[PDB]
């Protein structure tokens, strides 16, 4: 996946002969590599003057734009045709910037290969002084003109991957139909199904999550909100929705098959209890594959993000860190399932370990918020966010103490229940207000025509926001109660059922919340992550 | 093709793959039926040899498009409404999903309120309704064109003989078992070869093709090679008729069966050899006099790898022998019990033969003008 192929897609057909021969430049190094002192110095210098000719074209465009733009304003003041004129110029602006920056990545990798041939320090410092501070970076007039036009007028995927998505989605839907049929017809056995549907819930809470990030990226891209710059990915490559849909469908197939095998009775040599282990082991291996296949770039990026987030205090916080920390805050059911599986398979909550593994993601997020406060050194909204996330620890620990007292029979159970319901109310209201105010930006003072919405809107129909608001109000109450029950306070038998039927709703809440969080981050700048 | 139709192809192909796996598993495990049912729900063969035909026609159009041969000019389709291979694969997958679901429902035991004999009827009625849909959706243009072409073919002597007419006439010449299975369905649902129907309805495609050729000859007045083609297609008439006569003769049991079989086998060998020679020389143009570097190939070739030709030639040689024996045996001379499995395991191979023949016929017809159909 070298950049030479990538640029070949974005090279203007008309200016094909005007692009530099970077691809041919790479070859000659290998041939010259695959008397020493004096022959080498001079021929290196021929790579500098070549860029001058191309540099001429961008410079002259600045003068042309001003002269061309000014004249047509007067005549217009004194419909479809008028707008078509500016389309050509706007498109050409973008690719000029693409050429400039992405050219940096090329020579640097190749330069160091020959640097060690002679084992000298002069070559390394040669480029530092005469490249970085070149005046090419002092051009800023481009941005000024873009904004001027808008103010005046307004105020006054490859076929093959799509086929793969279709294949996986079809096999997944039919596998679901078969699984439902088998569950409803061929499960008359009574062997405590719950220790199965609990361990296998940690597949659904992730398959749903990726199937939902699919639609999430769909909405992000084809709605006018850029999801690449803020996520600081490489603009060169991007995972469209189709890629996420196929990656999620693959794990969906490898989950449905394992579940089915656990349901039916394959060859007796294979015990019934090994399939979940095989499935989760394969998933972990697929995540941690050290080879160069199966979307190694994205997997490596995600692995690096996980490493950075799970030891947040020692690493600077970007946006991706916060986003994944929050997603893990919501997907605590996956951690609970993993811990339960480990304990179950080691044995066949004693020391409250279930509480610890339930609160771990809130710990990550809270420590990340504290680190952000330390770096930025401003109280608001960082300590407010920290307190919001600390309410989760308070909730879980207080519920655990209440359950322990209830088991012991101490008379303080009533007071513990009272203070616990108080904590429920405060934390639910506080997190809801926070989510509606800062994470989305809704309920602003300056919104007259849109009523209780942002001053500027992005998604087409306000009904979307209006329904999503009530959805979040009625579902955020489910999150805290779900975690409280999963803390197995009392939970005689009917707690796991409610937890299982509610966790997917929590993932759905995260889907909506993601929609609006990134919309807000692009429109306004709520978190000071940019500039 | 548009992204959405590619996704639909993915969906239908995936559901088809899993349905096939389920069908194999259900047949191997959940078939607790020792009653003689197998050779009475072996009438879904008549839909299987249509599903596979549609898949292979999709592959044919893809191969034509990629290799370079233009299938649109020859098939006199409007260039603004071409049917790229994705559409064919999608529609074939859809029909395959319907077929698999029907067979599955028949295998299992759903609510007893409905009988087990209605599923094949429902599937075939759905297929015909979809084909003849009077609405303006679901490829209304292509379906209407196919219907008109079918009308033209079935009444070949009356209307003009175009390339599509002859091509589909040949296609139906290969797919005789579908007509045989339609006749079987009619007879079985009536009772639930007394009149020799199993032979006439099995050779009718030969009649269509032969009379079409004769009409072309009469309207053009040139024997070479229309008369030869007529002879080739009449060999099928003779084969089937003599096979039926032998069946009746053996049933009666007089003392002429040895000579009857001698002459029948002589007729078989001569007809098969002569039709193979025709297919190789007149139809395909191979073995041209002027080909030194190409050895036994045309002076011009289109498909890159010559190994494809070197394999397909021998494949046709070895499979065309199978088609004639298959038709004779489906004519059930005596074939007490060892015929209705061989016919089934051979017919899909026959459709595969017709697939490769399509490849090379259309290639040759574009390259040369073996069919006096242009200019």
Residue of A432, A441, A514, A434 lying closest to A475 (CA atoms): A432
Let me know: does B323 contact B353? Beta carbons within 8 Å. yes
The SS3 call for residue A86 is helix
Chain A residues in contact with chain B using a Cβ-Cβ cutoff of 8 Å: 157, 159, 162-171, 173-175, 178
Quote the CA–CA distance of B298 and A117 in Å, as a whole number.
57
Q: Confirm whether A123 is domain-assigned.
A: yes
**Nearest CA of chain B to the CA of A161: how many Å?**
9
B232 assigned ligand-binding residue: yes
Q: How many CB atoms lie within 10 A of CB A476?
A: 19
Residue of B153, B278, B161, B281 lying closest to B217 (CA atoms): B161
Per-residue DSSP letters for A24-73?
A: HHHHHHHHHH--HHHHSTGGGGGGSTTHHHHHHHHHHHHHHHHHHHHHHH
Let me know: does B85 contact B61? Beta carbons within 8 Å. yes
Number of H helices, E strands in chain B: 14, 0
Quote the CA–CA distance of A85 and A210 in Å, as a whole number.
42
Q: How many CB atoms lie within 10 A of CB A113?
A: 11
User: Long-range contact list for B310-313, CB < 8 A, 24+ apart?
Assistant: B312/B356, B312/B359, B312/B360, B313/B280, B313/B286
Let me know: does A491 contact A485? Beta carbons within 8 Å. yes
Let me know: does A11 contact A19? Beta carbons within 8 Å. yes
For tokens 């079987």, the residue is B184
Let me know: does A289 contact A299? Beta carbons within 8 Å. yes
Q: How many CB atoms lie within 10 A of CB A470?
A: 9
Contact A157 B3 (CB under 8 A): yes
Q: How many CB atoms lie within 10 A of CB A25?
A: 14
Q: Confirm whether B186 is domain-assigned.
A: no
Tokens (6 digits) for B256: 């002429």
Chain B residues in contact with chain A using a Cβ-Cβ cutoff of 8 Å: 1, 3, 6-15, 17-19, 22
Contact B10 A166 (CB under 8 A): yes
Instruction: Give A89's contacts (C-beta < 8 A, 6+ positions apart).
Output: A65
Quote the CA–CA distance of B324 and B272 in Å, as a whole number.
7
Q: Confirm whether A187 is domain-assigned.
A: no
Q: How many CB atoms lie within 10 A of CB A30?
A: 10
Residue of B nearest to A178 (CA): B22
Q: Confirm whether B327 is domain-assigned.
A: no
Provide the residue range defining the domain that includes B29: 1-68+84-138
Domain count, chain B: 1
**Nearest CA of chain B to the CA of A373: how many Å?**
46
Quote the CA–CA distance of A339 and A467 in Å, as a whole number.
36
The SS3 call for residue B246 is helix
Q: Confirm whether B20 is domain-assigned.
A: yes
Quote the CA–CA distance of B155 and A403 in Å, as a whole number.
86
What is the DSSP code (8-state) at residue B280?
I
Contact B7 A165 (CB under 8 A): yes
In angstroms, the first-to-last Cα distance of chain A is 31
The SS3 call for residue A501 is helix
Contact B10 A170 (CB under 8 A): yes
Check the CA dihedral A471-A477-A478-A480 and report its sign: positive
Residue of A324, A175, A183, A311 lying closest to A253 (CA atoms): A175
Let me know: does B249 contact B231? Beta carbons within 8 Å. no
For tokens 């659904």, the residue is A204
Residue of B155, B153, B157, B133 lying closest to B143 (CA atoms): B133
Instruction: Give A215's contacts (C-beta < 8 A, 6+ positions apart).
Output: A241, A511
Quote the CA–CA distance of A30 and A34 in Å, as a whole number.
6
Quote the CA–CA distance of B122 and A374 in Å, as a whole number.
72
B283 assigned ligand-binding residue: no
Contact A171 B18 (CB under 8 A): yes
Q: Confirm whether A417 is domain-assigned.
A: no
To test the contact with chain B by mutation, choose from A158, A160, A161, A163 the residue with the greatest count of B C-beta atoms within 10 A, namely A163
Where is chain A broken, named by the residue before each break, C–N > 2.5 Å? 34, 78, 156, 348
Residue of A475, A459, A486, A484 lying closest to A508 (CA atoms): A475
To test the contact with chain B by mutation, choose from A171, A241, A253, A266 the residue with the greatest count of B C-beta atoms within 10 A, namely A171
State the burial class of residue B322 (Cβ atoms within 10 Å of its Cβ: 0-12, 13-18, 19+).
Answer: middle
Residue of B210, B208, B205 lying closest to B231 (CA atoms): B210
Let me know: does B17 contact A253? Beta carbons within 8 Å. no
Quote the CA–CA distance of A131 and A48 in Å, as a whole number.
10
Q: How many CB atoms lie within 10 A of CB A102?
A: 16
Quote the CA–CA distance of B153 and B185 in Å, as a whole number.
23
Quote the CA–CA distance of A216 and A210 in Å, as a whole number.
9
Quote the CA–CA distance of A512 and A357 in Å, as a whole number.
26
Q: What count of Cα atoms within 13 Å lies in the side-chain half-sphere of residue B338?
A: 1
Tokens (6 digits) for B157: 């002597």
Quote the CA–CA distance of A480 and A330 in Å, as a whole number.
10
Residue of A333, A322, A377 lying closest to A358 (CA atoms): A333
Quote the CA–CA distance of A243 and A313 in Å, as a whole number.
32
**Nearest CA of chain A to the CA of B33: how many Å?**
20
**Nearest CA of chain B to the CA of A278: how many Å?**
22
Method: cryo-EM
Q: Confirm whether B318 is domain-assigned.
A: no
Residue of A302, A305, A326, A328 lying closest to A315 (CA atoms): A305
The SS3 call for residue B178 is helix
Quote the CA–CA distance of B43 and B285 in Å, as a whole number.
38
Residue of A185, A202, A176 lying closest to A264 (CA atoms): A185
Residues of A in contact with B10 (CB under 8 A): 162-170
Let me know: does A338 contact A202? Beta carbons within 8 Å. yes
Contact B18 A164 (CB under 8 A): no
Quote the CA–CA distance of B45 and B43 in Å, as a whole number.
5
Where is chain B broken, named by the residue before each break, C–N > 2.5 Å? 192
**Nearest CA of chain A to the CA of B270: how many Å?**
48
Quote the CA–CA distance of A486 and A354 in Å, as a whole number.
9
Q: Confirm whether A245 is domain-assigned.
A: no
User: CA of A31: how far to CAs of A41, A108, A110, B144, B160, in Å?
Assistant: 18, 19, 13, 63, 67
Helix (H) or strand (E) holding B23: helix B3-29
Quote the CA–CA distance of B165 and B151 in Å, as a whole number.
10
Quote the CA–CA distance of B112 and B115 in Å, as a whole number.
6
Residue of A170, A263, A162 lying closest to B18 (CA atoms): A170
Instruction: Give B265's contacts (C-beta < 8 A, 6+ positions apart).
Output: none
State the burial class of residue A188 (Cβ atoms within 10 Å of its Cβ: 0-12, 13-18, 19+).
Answer: exposed
B82 — alpha (psi -120 to 50), left (phi > 0) or beta?
Answer: beta
Quote the CA–CA distance of B74 and B65 in Å, as a whole number.
13
Q: How many CB atoms lie within 10 A of CB A49?
A: 8
Tokens (6 digits) for A127: 């480029």
């Amino acid at each position: 996946m070298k950049f030479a192929e990538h640029l070949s897609a974005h090279i203007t057909p008309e200016w094909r002969k005007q692009y530099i021969q970077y691809e041919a430049f790479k070859d000659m190094l290998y041939s010259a590599q695959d008397y020493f002192a004096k022959f080498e110095e001079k021929f290196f210098q021929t790579c500098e003057k070549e860029l001058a000719k191309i540099n001429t074209f961008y410079s002259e465009k600045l003068a042309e734009a001003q002269r061309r733009f000014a004249t047509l304003q007067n005549e217009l003041q004194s419909i479809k045709d008028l707008k078509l004129a500016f389309s050509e110029f706007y498109l050409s602006l973008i690719l000029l910037q693409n050429y400039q920056n992405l050219n940096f990545t090329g020579f640097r990798k190749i330069l160091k290969k020959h640097d060690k041939i002679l084992e000298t320090s002069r070559g390394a410092d040669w480029r530092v002084a005469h490249v970085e501070v070149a005046p090419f970076y002092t051009c800023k007039k481009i941005n000024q003109l873009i904004s001027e036009t808008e103010a005046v007028v307004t105020n006054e995927a490859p076929a093959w991957t799509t086929f793969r998505v279709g294949l996986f989605c079809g096999i997944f839907i039919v596998l679901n139909i078969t699984l439902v049929l088998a569950a409803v017809f061929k499960l008359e056995t009574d062997r405590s199904i719950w220790p199965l549907i609990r361990i296998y819930r940690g597949g659904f809470l992730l398959i749903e999550f990726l199937f939902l990030l699919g639609i999430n990226t769909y909405g992000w891209r084809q709605a006018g909100v850029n999801h690449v710059l803020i996520f600081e990915l490489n603009p060169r490559s991007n995972l469209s929705h189709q890629h996420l849909f196929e990656i999620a469908g693959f794990l969906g197939i490898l989950w449905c098959l394992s579940l089915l095998a656990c349901f039916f009775a394959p060859i007796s040599v294979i015990p019934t209890y090994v399939y979940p282990l095989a499935l989760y082991g394969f998933m972990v291996f697929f995540l941690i594959n050290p080879t160069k296949t199966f979307y190694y770039k994205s997997r490596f990026w995600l692995l690096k993000l996980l490493f950075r987030v799970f030891t947040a205090p020692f690493h600077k916080v970007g946006f991706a860190d916060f986003w994944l920390a929050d997603q893990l805050n919501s997907l605590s059911v996956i951690l609970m399932d993993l811990e339960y599986m480990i304990c179950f398979y080691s044995l066949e909550y004693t020391y409250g370990v279930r509480a610890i593994v339930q609160c771990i993601p809130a710990w990550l997020r809270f420590i990340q918020c504290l680190r952000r406060y330390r770096d930025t050194k401003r109280a608001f909204p960082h300590l407010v966010n920290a307190g919001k996330y600390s309410t989760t620890f308070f909730m879980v620990t207080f519920a655990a103490l209440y359950s322990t007292h209830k088991e012991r029979g101490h008379s303080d159970t009533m007071v513990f229940f009272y203070l616990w319901i108080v904590f429920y109310i405060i934390s639910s209201c506080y997190t809801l207000i926070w989510d509606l105010k800062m994470d989305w930006g809704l309920f602003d003072k300056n919104a007259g025509e849109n009523t209780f919405l942002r001053e500027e809107i992005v998604y087409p129909q306000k009904a979307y926001y209006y329904c999503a608001i009530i959805e979040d109000v009625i579902l955020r109450f489910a999150w805290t109660i779900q975690i409280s029950i999963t803390s197995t306070t009392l939970l005689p038998h009917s707690g796991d059922i409610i937890a299982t039927v509610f966790a997917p709703l929590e993932v759905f809440r995260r889907f909506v919340w993601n929609f609006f969080r990134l919309e807000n981050e692009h429109l306004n700048n709520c978190g000071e992550f940019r500039a």
